[PDB]
Write a protein that binds this ligand. Structure first.
Ligand SMILES: *[C@@H]1O[C@H](CO)[C@@H](O)[C@H](O)[C@H]1NC(C)=O
Lengths: 48, 50
């Protein structure tokens, strides 16, 4: 089971992680049943 | 989940994921009914010493 917990926060801080507390609610539970040892972040390019 | 008690209306703002509730003893104190998704409080039936 892949448990994803999420919390969405409106901030206005420029550079770093804001200092505070926010408990993450569970978003989705996925029955994927696969081995995971490595992961990748996906970004988006901007072209002009 | 089995038990005995009186089911009454409640004012506990359950979050969407949240289904039931537990007291210190871990006995269920509130439950969300299937089919209608409403939140029912579970209050033990009156008892005491004679
Ligand atoms: C049946 O249960 C689902 C939740 O599992 C609910 O969304 C749906 O409204 C229920 N249907 C009826 C007719 O109660």
């Amino acid at each position: 089971y892949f448990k994803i917990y999420s919390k969405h926060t409106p901030i206005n801080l420029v550079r770093d992680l804001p200092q505070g507390f926010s408990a993450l609610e569970p978003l989705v539970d996925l029955p994927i049943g696969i081995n995971i040892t490595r992961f990748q972040t996906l970004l988006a390019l901007h072209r002009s | 989940l089995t038990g005995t008690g009186v089911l009454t209306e409640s004012n506990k703002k359950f979050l969407p994921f949240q289904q039931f509730g537990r007291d210190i003893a871990d006995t269920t104190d509130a439950v969300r009914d299937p089919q209608t998704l409403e939140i029912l409080d579970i209050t033990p039936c009156s008892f005491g010493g004679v």
